[PDB]
Amino acid sequence: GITRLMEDLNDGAIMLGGGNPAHIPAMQDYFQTLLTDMVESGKAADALCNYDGPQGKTALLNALAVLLRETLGWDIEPQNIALTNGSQSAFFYLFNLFAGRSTKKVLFPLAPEYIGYADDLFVSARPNIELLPEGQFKYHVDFEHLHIGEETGMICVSRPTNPTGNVITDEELMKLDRLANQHNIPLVIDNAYGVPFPGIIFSEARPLWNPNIILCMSLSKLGLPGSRCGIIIANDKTITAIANMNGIISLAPGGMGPAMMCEMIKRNDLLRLSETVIKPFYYQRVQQTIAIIRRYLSEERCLIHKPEGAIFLWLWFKDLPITTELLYQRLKARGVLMVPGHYFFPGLDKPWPHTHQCMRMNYVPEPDKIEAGVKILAEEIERAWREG
């Protein structure tokens, strides 16, 4: 299933099934100038020609520590930070450190989640659904049926979330934090899209960190998908354990990402760009894309998860009389690619027809491409309701 999807998603197509960020003109200009300065000062060469240069992993651990300490008041030191090749390698280490053979599992208390899609070890909890105005909706943690036991090795959430754009509420997160502490297991939060960088969040969300939290951050959604710089923030024992693993599997970041981050932090540009350039760009783009969708599909044929952050729209074709696996084939035959939703719910205790009524799209591509894709989508949704 996923292998074919990956093949399709690679091999005038309207490609709305990917996870790459936008090319924001102001950001491209910023990076071009930054790179020009760094090459001219010798810093680019230092980054590539040294295993751990003056702006290497070590300088960055110090810079990130100072940044988080001074901007948010978090008691972080370099010993609380580890760097990886990206988000996905970060989770591979965590899963190995806390899950597997007693045999422990990773609990996703608020499915759907992307890492489950990307990678018997995963257990997804079915979320509650809150219907919202304008044909929107929001998933919630169902605490009444949330099962955490001796076999749970870690609790994992993202904020904001790929694929829904959901932002788990302060109350939900604090409850999960209390449960994790009570069960002596870590609460892992994927912050690839959140604050302080890249800041692709459109809703309220109080930041959270304490020694029982493992926080994953990344440089890629800043508009540097070609750099490979994942960041893990955790208690020093966890960081030490991660140190060892990265030493063996060797999925450390290259030098250019860390060097660029050091420079952006030094110039006091990292937070500024996230809040004043990146966030507004995506907020406008998500609003424009919803408006395009609504010209073709009402709430009677498409419910949209409230877009609280990240770069996706999660579409729920409520009561669609065919599956989105079938819809996907029909769209593909017409040159439109989106991701079937079922793939983001691995490990549910019980099957749920809902998983076959959703799809994920990326709202970043140019609007003419978005509109052409949406027009075809609406035609296929109409066809399904008319004739199966």
What does the binding site for Cl ion look like in residue numbers (CB under 5 A)? 37-38, 41, 134, 281, 284-285, 294
Q: Binding mask 111-150 vs a second copy (x if CB under 8 A, - otherwise)?
A: -------xx-------------------------------
| Number of residues engaging a second copy in binding (CB under 8 A) | 48
H or E element that contains 296: helix 279-296
Q: Binding to a second copy by residue 254, rule CB under 8 A? A: yes
Q: Binding to a second copy by residue 250, rule CB under 8 A? A: yes
Look up tokens 């599992």; give the residue.
Answer: 105
The residue (of 53 and 127) whose beta carbon lies closer to a second copy is: 53
Q: Binding to a second copy by residue 26, rule CB under 8 A? A: no
Evaluated on CA atoms 159, 163, 166, 170, the torsion sign reads negative
> How many Å apart are CA 315 and CA 340, to the nearest integer?
10
Indicate which of a second copy, Cl ion, none lies near residue 6 (CB less than 5 to 8 Å, by partner kind): a second copy
Q: Using the rule CB under 8 A, which residue among 103, 210, 244, 287 binds a second copy?
A: 244
Residues 6+ apart with CB under 8 A from 262: 55, 59, 60, 63
Beta carbon of residue 317, minimum distance to Cl ion (angstroms, whole number): 16
Beta carbon of residue 229, minimum distance to a second copy (angstroms, whole number): 8
The residue (of 214 and 315) whose beta carbon lies closer to Cl ion is: 315
Tell me the helices (H) and strands (E) count for the chain, helix number first: 13, 15
Q: Binding to a second copy by residue 215, rule CB under 8 A? A: no
Q: Using the rule CB under 8 A, which residue among 4, 51, 184, 206 binds a second copy?
A: 51
Q: Is 372 exposed, middle or buried (0-12, 13-18, 19+ CB in 10 A)?
A: middle
Q: Binding to a second copy by residue 241, rule CB under 8 A? A: no
Beta carbon of residue 174, minimum distance to a second copy (angstroms, whole number): 31
Q: Binding to a second copy by residue 36, rule CB under 8 A? A: yes
Beta carbon of residue 166, minimum distance to Cl ion (angstroms, whole number): 19
Q: Which stretch binds a second copy (CB under 8 A): 44-52, 145-153, 208-216, 304-312?
A: 44-52
Evaluated on CA atoms 213, 218, 221, 225, the torsion sign reads negative
H or E element that contains 233: strand 230-233
- Best CA proximity match to 19, nearest among 280, 368, 360: 360
> How many Å apart are CA 233 and CA 247, to the nearest integer?
18
Evaluated on CA atoms 93, 94, 95, 100, the torsion sign reads positive
The residue (of 221 and 285) whose beta carbon lies closer to Cl ion is: 285
Residues 6+ apart with CB under 8 A from 21: 198, 220, 221, 222, 223, 225, 311, 364
DSSP string, 85-143: S-HHHHHHHHHHHHSB---BEEEESS---HHHHH---EEEPPPEEEEETTTEEEEE--G
Q: Binding to a second copy by residue 74, rule CB under 8 A? A: no
Indicate which of Cl ion, a second copy, none lies near residue 364 (CB less than 5 to 8 Å, by partner kind): none
Q: Using the rule CB under 8 A, which residue among 42, 54, 280, 335 binds a second copy?
A: 42
The residue (of 187 and 260) whose beta carbon lies closer to a second copy is: 260
The residue (of 178 and 267) whose beta carbon lies closer to Cl ion is: 267
Q: Binding to a second copy by residue 97, rule CB under 8 A? A: no
Q: Binding to a second copy by residue 251, rule CB under 8 A? A: yes
Phi then psi for residue 35, to 5 deg, are: -65, -40
Phi then psi for residue 138, to 5 deg, are: -145, 130
Q: What is the largest CA-CA distance in the chain?
A: 65
Q: How far is CA 384 from CA 124, 196, 298, 377, in A?
A: 29, 43, 15, 11
Indicate which of Cl ion, a second copy, none lies near residue 257 (CB less than 5 to 8 Å, by partner kind): a second copy
Indicate which of Cl ion, a second copy, none lies near residue 41 (CB less than 5 to 8 Å, by partner kind): Cl ion
List, in sequence order, every beta strand (DSSP E) within 133-227: 136-140, 152-158, 187-190, 213-218
Q: Using the rule CB under 8 A, which residue among 162, 191, 227, 289 binds a second copy?
A: 227
Indicate which of Cl ion, a second copy, none lies near residue 244 (CB less than 5 to 8 Å, by partner kind): a second copy
Question: Which residues contact a second copy by CB under 8 A?
Answer: 3, 6, 20, 23, 28, 31-32, 35-36, 39-40, 42, 44-45, 47-51, 53, 56, 85-89, 92, 118-119, 223-228, 244, 247-257, 260
